[PDB]
Design a protein around this ligand. Sequence first.
Ligand SMILES: CCc1ccc(/C=C2\SC(N[C@H](C(=O)NS(=O)(=O)c3ccc([N+](=O)[O-])cc3)c3ccc(F)cc3)=NC2=O)o1
Length: 559
Amino acid sequence: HHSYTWTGALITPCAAEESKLPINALSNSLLRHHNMVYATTSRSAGLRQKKVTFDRLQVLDDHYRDVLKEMKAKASTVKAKLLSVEEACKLTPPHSAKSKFGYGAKDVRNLSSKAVNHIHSVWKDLLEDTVTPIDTTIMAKNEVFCVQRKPARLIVFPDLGVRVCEKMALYDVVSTLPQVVMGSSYGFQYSPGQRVEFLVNTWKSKKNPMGFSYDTRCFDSTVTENDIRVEESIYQCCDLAPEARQAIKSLTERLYIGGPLTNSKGQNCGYRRCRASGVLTTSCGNTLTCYLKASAACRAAKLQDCTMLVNGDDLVVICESAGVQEDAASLRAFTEAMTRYSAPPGDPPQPEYDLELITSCSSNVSVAHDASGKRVYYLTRDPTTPLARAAWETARHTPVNSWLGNIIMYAPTLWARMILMTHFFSILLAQEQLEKALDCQIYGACYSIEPLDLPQIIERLHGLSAFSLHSYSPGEINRVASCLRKLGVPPLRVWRHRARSVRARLLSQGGRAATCGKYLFNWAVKTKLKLTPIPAASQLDLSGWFVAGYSGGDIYHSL
Ligand SMILES: CCc1ccc(/C=C2\SC(N[C@H](C(=O)NS(=O)(=O)c3ccc([N+](=O)[O-])cc3)c3ccc(F)cc3)=NC2=O)o1
């Protein structure tokens, strides 16, 4: 029951790989300690392979089956539709990996005959063949981090033609089934503010609240064939067209459960028997399985009033404390149950009695004060990785602009406002690219967004209070202070100075640009303004922005 088997062929790159942080005339103004930032490359693929390769064992008890029966009952109320070839094509990222069959994402988005015909043939084959394993490409991802070095993560994905077929058969399913099955516990249905709101209200719902985060060790590799078949059984509970059921069964047997791994050079690297990280069902599948195992585990551990929050493999549990000594014991039982279900912990889970001390999705709840001085909760996170990536994107253009996604997601934070906004608007100004649309990601889905719309976007997501938060917590303040000293990032006084400059320049520009200067940097001036709702704020269509997770699902949405 090994997660992977290898032939010995190396996981190769499909282009040039940089490890050291690229430096340009702008680097120093943001970060001086350049050696602490690095990018993971294929060179460390071998190390990752050893970590993700192990034997899985599963002992499924009655709690497991009891929870599953419940999940299926909810899933049976779901009705999902097949997406047309055109609709699926539209969801394909302009820069998605091209097909090995004479066409690329551009041809797919354009509905070229060649692309449409191959997709139809791939679909036909899925209906007629439910046994032959589908080929996948294994690659080492190039991600940026701050030292203290980790081996590159692996990404396994099927060909473009297959990815479009996954959309047709399962897009509607993975977009609507999770919230129906898990209710308020499905994390991807919330915007950052709504996530904090749910966490806060949940924590208050308890007489004596207690909570903890549970980090599974290499979750993808712990997903067994059984887990993937159980996932399919859940999808099949939905009201689906017979053609969709066949396609889902086929995709499960031939791709989701496992298959051969091929490097960029076309050499067989081995075989997979665990979760593929680059398929449409990755996020929904992990979310369902994690929720199923954790739910069953809570019962086995006898935790009282268990409220969960799941986002793929990230898990948050808030419940009624049965006492400090009892909580620590119950948690140990939880871990033991999760382990029996093939989901051992990476790091020992610890009970917390302070909401702000629980970290999940690399985030945590914190509190500040709005213009009225009222206590306001918001989502933040350790800025280390965002800043390292911001440094990289400062001297290198990338497919995904993490700084933009981070501003949108953490707009209310001290670090995003003082540093990210100031630094990058200064850059956008100097190059006059404020109106240029940029790609970023939100819950795994790719979105093309223009910087000029940030004020509106942030207002809709976080409200006007995002532009006026102050008096952050000492804990947050010092975590940011530490990070800046570690990376060698200039202090507040410097950023405030730059913000006034950036702010003044934006105000001069006028229109959309002035709005950015007025709202985004109102904290830079000594005498604040009023800051009132933005007229075009409602015009924005943020409908499918916070509905589901699509990490590795090759999903696109143009704003
Ligand atoms: C890493 C070390 C560090 C830097 C900043 C802090 C802590 C801060 S900064 C702050 N507030 C200012 C701010 O709002 N100033 S004001 O002039 O807008 C202001 C001051 C007082 C009030 N008031 O109501 O009393 C309102 C607004 C700030 C917010 C966002 C940002 F990116 C930088 C600085 N509150 C805090 O706890 O720690």
